[PDB]
Design a protein around this motif. Sequence first.
Motif, mmCIF file in Angstrom:
data_model
loop_
_atom_site.group_PDB
_atom_site.id
_atom_site.type_symbol
_atom_site.label_atom_id
_atom_site.label_comp_id
_atom_site.label_asym_id
_atom_site.label_seq_id
_atom_site.Cartn_x
_atom_site.Cartn_y
_atom_site.Cartn_z
ATOM 1 N N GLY A 33 0.782 -1.204 0.000
ATOM 2 C CA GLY A 33 0.000 0.000 0.000
ATOM 3 C C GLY A 33 0.826 1.270 0.000
ATOM 4 N N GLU A 34 2.047 1.217 0.527
ATOM 5 C CA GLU A 34 2.860 2.403 0.724
ATOM 6 C C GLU A 34 3.645 2.717 -0.541
ATOM 7 O OE1 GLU A 34 2.210 3.712 3.695
ATOM 8 O OE2 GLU A 34 1.091 1.915 4.261
ATOM 9 N N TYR A 35 4.493 3.730 -0.458
ATOM 10 C CA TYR A 35 5.279 4.160 -1.600
ATOM 11 C C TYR A 35 6.593 3.398 -1.673
ATOM 12 C CZ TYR A 35 2.813 8.048 -3.738
ATOM 13 O OH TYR A 35 1.942 8.823 -4.463
ATOM 14 N N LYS A 36 7.151 3.328 -2.876
ATOM 15 C CA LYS A 36 8.389 2.604 -3.106
ATOM 16 C C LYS A 36 9.066 3.172 -4.341
ATOM 17 C CE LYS A 36 7.876 -1.075 -6.300
ATOM 18 N NZ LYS A 36 8.496 -2.405 -6.510
ATOM 19 N N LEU A 37 10.305 2.757 -4.568
ATOM 20 C CA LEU A 37 11.069 3.183 -5.730
ATOM 21 C C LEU A 37 10.893 2.157 -6.837
ATOM 22 C CD1 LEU A 37 14.411 4.331 -4.115
ATOM 23 C CD2 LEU A 37 13.099 5.707 -5.665
ATOM 24 N N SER A 38 10.560 2.621 -8.033
ATOM 25 C CA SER A 38 10.254 1.703 -9.118
ATOM 26 C C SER A 38 11.482 0.887 -9.484
ATOM 27 C CB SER A 38 9.744 2.465 -10.333
ATOM 28 O OG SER A 38 10.748 3.291 -10.868
ATOM 29 N N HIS A 39 11.276 -0.417 -9.650
ATOM 30 C CA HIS A 39 12.290 -1.422 -9.955
ATOM 31 C C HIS A 39 13.102 -1.839 -8.742
ATOM 32 C CE1 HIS A 39 11.532 -0.093 -14.170
ATOM 33 N NE2 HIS A 39 11.609 -1.396 -14.351
ATOM 34 N N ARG A 40 12.839 -1.263 -7.575
ATOM 35 C CA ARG A 40 13.398 -1.708 -6.308
ATOM 36 C C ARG A 40 12.337 -2.454 -5.514
ATOM 37 N NH1 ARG A 40 15.789 2.576 -9.104
ATOM 38 N NH2 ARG A 40 18.016 2.056 -9.033
ATOM 39 N N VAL A 41 12.776 -3.127 -4.449
ATOM 40 C CA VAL A 41 11.856 -3.871 -3.598
ATOM 41 C C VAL A 41 11.143 -2.919 -2.643
ATOM 42 C CG1 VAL A 41 13.462 -5.774 -3.752
ATOM 43 C CG2 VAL A 41 13.402 -4.354 -1.726
ATOM 44 N N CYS A 42 10.016 -3.378 -2.098
ATOM 45 C CA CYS A 42 9.261 -2.583 -1.135
ATOM 46 C C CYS A 42 10.015 -2.532 0.184
ATOM 47 C CB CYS A 42 7.869 -3.175 -0.927
ATOM 48 S SG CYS A 42 6.715 -2.174 0.065
ATOM 49 N N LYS A 43 10.554 -1.362 0.519
ATOM 50 C CA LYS A 43 11.294 -1.201 1.763
ATOM 51 C C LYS A 43 10.423 -1.417 2.987
ATOM 52 C CE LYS A 43 15.635 -0.586 2.557
ATOM 53 N NZ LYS A 43 16.557 -1.688 2.169
ATOM 54 N N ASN A 44 9.119 -1.210 2.865
ATOM 55 C CA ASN A 44 8.160 -1.566 3.897
ATOM 56 C C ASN A 44 8.065 -3.089 3.943
ATOM 57 O OD1 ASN A 44 6.229 -0.437 5.878
ATOM 58 N ND2 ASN A 44 4.681 -1.405 4.580
ATOM 59 N N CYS A 45 7.169 -3.614 4.764
ATOM 60 C CA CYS A 45 6.974 -5.054 4.830
ATOM 61 C C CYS A 45 6.465 -5.537 3.482
ATOM 62 C CB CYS A 45 5.987 -5.394 5.943
ATOM 63 S SG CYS A 45 6.516 -4.878 7.584
ATOM 64 N N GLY A 46 7.320 -6.197 2.713
ATOM 65 C CA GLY A 46 6.865 -6.707 1.436
ATOM 66 C C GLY A 46 8.008 -7.181 0.563
ATOM 67 N N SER A 47 7.673 -7.371 -0.711
ATOM 68 C CA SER A 47 8.564 -7.974 -1.683
ATOM 69 C C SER A 47 8.449 -7.263 -3.018
ATOM 70 C CB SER A 47 8.250 -9.457 -1.850
ATOM 71 O OG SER A 47 7.189 -9.645 -2.766
ATOM 72 N N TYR A 48 8.940 -7.907 -4.070
ATOM 73 C CA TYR A 48 8.998 -7.332 -5.404
ATOM 74 C C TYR A 48 7.904 -7.837 -6.330
ATOM 75 C CZ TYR A 48 11.206 -5.580 -9.635
ATOM 76 O OH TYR A 48 11.471 -4.944 -10.813
ATOM 77 N N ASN A 49 7.696 -9.153 -6.410
ATOM 78 C CA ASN A 49 6.621 -9.744 -7.213
ATOM 79 C C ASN A 49 6.723 -9.385 -8.691
ATOM 80 O OD1 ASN A 49 4.303 -9.821 -4.551
ATOM 81 N ND2 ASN A 49 4.821 -11.567 -5.861
ATOM 82 N N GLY A 50 7.908 -9.023 -9.156
ATOM 83 C CA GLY A 50 8.084 -8.665 -10.547
ATOM 84 C C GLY A 50 7.909 -9.862 -11.454
#
Lengths: 50, 114
Positions: A33-50
């Motif tokens: 739900g939060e913001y992240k840098l495109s092509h990087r992983v979610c620095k919050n609790c999460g993953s990439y799922n690319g």
Amino acid sequence: AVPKRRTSKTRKNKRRTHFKISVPGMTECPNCGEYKLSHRVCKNCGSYNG
Amino acid sequence: GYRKLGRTSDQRKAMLRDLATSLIISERIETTEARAKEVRSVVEKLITLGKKGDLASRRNAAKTLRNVEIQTALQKLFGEIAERYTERQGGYTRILKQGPRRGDGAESVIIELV
RNA sequence: UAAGUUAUUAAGGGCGCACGGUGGAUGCCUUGGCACUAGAAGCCGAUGAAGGACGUUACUAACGACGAUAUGCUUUGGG
RNA sequence: ACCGAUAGUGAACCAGUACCGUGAGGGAAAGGUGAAAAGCACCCCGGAAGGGGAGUGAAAUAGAACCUGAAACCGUGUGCU
RNA sequence: CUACCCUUGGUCAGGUUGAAGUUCAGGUAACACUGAAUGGAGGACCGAACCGACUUACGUUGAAAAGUGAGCGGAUGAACU
RNA sequence: UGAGUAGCGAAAGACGGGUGAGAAUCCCGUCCACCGAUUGACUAAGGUUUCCAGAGGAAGGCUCGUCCGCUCUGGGUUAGUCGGGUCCUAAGCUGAGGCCGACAGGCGUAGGCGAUGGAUAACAGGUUGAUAUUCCUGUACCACCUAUAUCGAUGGGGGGACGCAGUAGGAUAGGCGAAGCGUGCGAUUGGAUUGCACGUCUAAGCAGUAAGGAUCCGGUACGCUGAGCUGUGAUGGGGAGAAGACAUUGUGUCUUCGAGUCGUUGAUUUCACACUGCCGAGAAAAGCCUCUAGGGUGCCCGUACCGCAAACCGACACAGGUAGUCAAGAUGAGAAUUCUAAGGUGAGCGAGCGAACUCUCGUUAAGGAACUCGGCAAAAUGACCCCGUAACUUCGGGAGAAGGGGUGCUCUUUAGGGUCCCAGAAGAGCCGCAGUGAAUAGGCCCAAGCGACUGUUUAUCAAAAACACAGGUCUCUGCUAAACCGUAAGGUGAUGUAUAGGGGCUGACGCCUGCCCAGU
RNA sequence: UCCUAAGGUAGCGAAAUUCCUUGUCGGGUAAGUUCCGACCCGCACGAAAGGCGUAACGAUUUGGGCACUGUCUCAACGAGAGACUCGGUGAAAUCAUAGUACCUGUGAAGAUGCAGGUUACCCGCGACAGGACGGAAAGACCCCGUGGAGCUUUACUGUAGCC
RNA sequence: UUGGCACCUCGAUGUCGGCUCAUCGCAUCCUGGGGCUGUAGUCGGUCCCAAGGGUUGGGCUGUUCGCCCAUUAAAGCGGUACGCGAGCUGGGUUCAGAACGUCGUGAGACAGUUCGGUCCCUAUCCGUCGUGGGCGUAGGAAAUUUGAGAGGAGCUGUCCUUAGUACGAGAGGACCGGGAUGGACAUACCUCUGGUGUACCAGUUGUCGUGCCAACGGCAUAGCUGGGUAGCUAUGUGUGGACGGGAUAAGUGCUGAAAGCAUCUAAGCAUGAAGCCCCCCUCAAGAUGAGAUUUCCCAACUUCGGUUAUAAGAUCCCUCAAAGAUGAUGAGGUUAAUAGGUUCGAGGUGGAAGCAUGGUGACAUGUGGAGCUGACGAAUACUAAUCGAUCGAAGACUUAAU
């Protein structure tokens, strides 16, 4: 060499026209739900799922 | 060369042997982007030696790994790391970008064995 | 269609005002100095001087006071 | 019909001291909350610093980087260009 | 710090040359001449420590108020400390 | 303002796991890398609390910091034998009386102070976060005191007691290769007669030992002291590669128990100013000995820490400077060179990209100094063993002249030498582009000028044809010498005496040194 | 023949001395103002501020060879540090205010700023060095000051000392 | 040029000569065009036009100057603070030391000579060489272009033939033409010859390590040495300055008068240079005069009269190279070949490990031109370019025409 003459605060403020930074180029992660840098992983609790 | 890394030819080759050994030992390591794009081409060529499985391949692979214990890093190759990719061709690693780090602003990535 | 004229844009800058920061001038004040007047006084020391070192309080780092009787004692007046 | 903290002693402050020199010797700079510390109990963000309240106060842009608070300098908003 | 001096201590991997003298031989009336061993002199030779500062490049708001790199001289002495 | 510009101070780090508000930068770990005649170990100056443990993150740290040589709070230095005093005295300083002097004061005798030198009784092991011949265990030594003929000086004499250089030797420390113990016997083809790692141990007290030497006292004449080293024990002690037993990874660790130590080969720069040689002729006083005149006691200062350094001198956590002791393996002349051991270290900004230009480094077709002030700079030669070697000469030299050849490994035969170690002849063969296969270590020659030579100098633009020099010559000087400081005392000259001392010039050696005394 | 104190000797000589001068001759070189051997025409050598010569020595000065070479013909490539881009920290010399063009002139006679023309949309980044009589240092040179100070002498006036 | 004045500068304007790098004048050295000649020809002299390009390598010296050697079509003369030290060197000279000749009694000086000797700087603003971003060019975009203007290039030799002809007694020996191959210079490129090639191949010295033999790794300049792929390069390989058009200078003229003749000139008409403007190559619409052509997109809400977002299109972000300081510009982003790997080749090296056999042994031979391989050609999604977000139009007013 040394400056021949003092620099106005007009010349200085003009020359600092392009001296800045840009917005980090970020997206919204569709798991955290939060913001992240495109092509990087979610620095919050999460993953990439690319 | 392929790409220099601020190291001289000797320090660079040593750093790449170090990184590849650490990767095959732990199986996922956090490093810098520019080195993760170089260990990518050095670990994948070791799993090819591990998939050939000769005795000339053990000896041509022994000259790029380090002698660390766990098994040795050469016995983990030719064993588990080479047994799991027996039908996969290429693409034995995967790099993931984490973001810049404090102190350097150097893009730190994670690299692991797919 | 054709000929002609003219305008908004401000990345940034200029001037005018409003509100902040910095820095410590000025105003007013004074624990202290300056220059003098009238009256004491104009030497201390081998009975150990001037000047200092080290210590002393329930703590004590320092300054004043003090000296193994040590952050002080006795006694005679004031209060 | 002397000065009023760049003045008056070098020293209104614990100065002939920080210091600086092998030594003889040279030598600064530092004032001010309020009438009374009544010097911010308590709540909130923060690891702390620091705030925002709410209280003390006649006043808190009086909060110990404490009277007043100016100029250079550094910013934020805007009217005309 | 620097220059001489005084007193009393310290240091100088290694390796090589081979003066005087001596001693055997031989030669002479003899001294004293030729040879071979032995000996181990010298402001002696090569070369590290050590002490210098000849050439050059770098540096020149130097790393530093005189340095660094590469070579270079002496290195048992009128040494260096 | 210059401007988010120059710089961030010689260098290898990588990952894993923690802790934490926050990690390239702090803690632990594995791999890699650097020094190793030193970046390792110990101490004198000099700093003067910087050393340790528990906390901290405002400022200092050329970045960060959860960390520190920084801030706070508590700690840490133990002596009869170690270095100094209660022992001695160089050089020098001071000096009762004393001499000289406008004052102040200068000089100086007896005496005194004074080390860098002389004398002087203790060694192993263990222990803490921080001391360690200091505390503890064991084993010792010295001075004085009390119990159950000797003393001889303030005086005489001996000793103490000494330079430089050269080899020859004795012994030892340390070094290495087998055997003897204690653990291991496997990666990936192979083997198991295979791979590692340890070997002792002090002082003191007893034995014997290369070598080497006419104030009873000293002087005149007519078996003795000392001495490295070995050895019995001290040591049923201590230690140790490690081995078997106990609870919280008992990580680990307390705890008791018990193990080998043998012969050989080269060899100090440590152990004798000893012996031999030489000219430059190589401290003083006490301790000590000598002759006569006559069962206890044992004090004060230093001690932590850094000490080629981030803690000293350089304003700095600064490529500089800083006395001394120790000194491993392969190779070797070796304290050189390259790689390593004991032990320490990764250097207080990084990540990218791989433009111009500057700096440091490697290579280059054909030619070759054409460059340029100038072969500057770089390249070339360079090690050892053999031949060979010119003009000149002061007969020493020049000379490593110049110019050439060889150099690896394997196997055969084969006189050496030391007592396993060191040194050789020759023959046969193998290989590559290459054989001192890396690092390191002369380019040479032909002529001229100057200065004879080694030496010295403008600390920071000059190192030389300049200064010095041995030798030459002139001159003053008869001793309270002249000359010089003070211009007094008192000194140097010199504890010297014309073959000696001061001054001027020239400057090894060879051949020589002309004329003029107007004038100063 | 004139002079004085007597009037340069042995050796050396275009020299660390020679102006005229690249003297003249020979050697080395394809070509040699340097170099070597000679001559002597010694501006202005000379016998202990010694003359002449010398084996060895020298981080001395000078000329010529052999070898080796990016010195160079004539440059090319590669490695690392800085430079360049990103994150942390972050100075200095200098500075009358500046919205700071070129030409031909002009002017205290070499103009970014004046006249007349020509050119030029606003703001940056890498790089070069012509100019700002660029920056450092109140010109060491020159001159001046009834300036100083070091040294000299048969400049003046004195003195320590000696007779 | 040697001077003369003393006007700017002494709170400072660095002096030669050369190197590197140029720019300008014409009073022209070569090449081009001509008149006169005491021009027979090949060569010359002397004048006039002309600045487009070109204008050497060494010996001696500090040399600028000069002399010499060998060439060359030719080896021009001048200005720019005798161009140029914020570009370099520093030999000379003007520092301090020390020596010679001469001058001074002397300390010391030169009419001179000789050996030696610290040359600073992180460029503000104008100037110049490259590169981007903002806005403008009356809607917003993608490509392709015209060319006002600007820059570049511009040089010359030698042979063969016409012809041993014209000319000259001979000796000698052409213009005007026509071909061929060079020198210097410029530019593009890497198939060839070479250079480099620090992540390619191999051989080999010392030492330390993987427990040991065999096989490998670290360090010694990349330890060293013999080769070497892609890329970057010259000494290597290609090309160029060709052919032509217009107007002219000096010169040569035709008709022609003023001046019954003469006369190139006054009217008219020609001809005539390496030079001028085109032709050749590159830039160029910020050419504010902002040009042209082809194509693409073009409704909802308001009374705002204007707004909105979205369309065509482009960026953020990511994988890269033919490009490059960075960006920018190019190849790509799952409806995919952009890179890495993986399979297969090219080129490179030179015949591997292991085993077997022959040798006492060093070693040799066989399988197998084997096996390794950075950058080069092809293919394959295995891994990574995920998801997503931002910017971007509704077209002003006059007049004529229809």
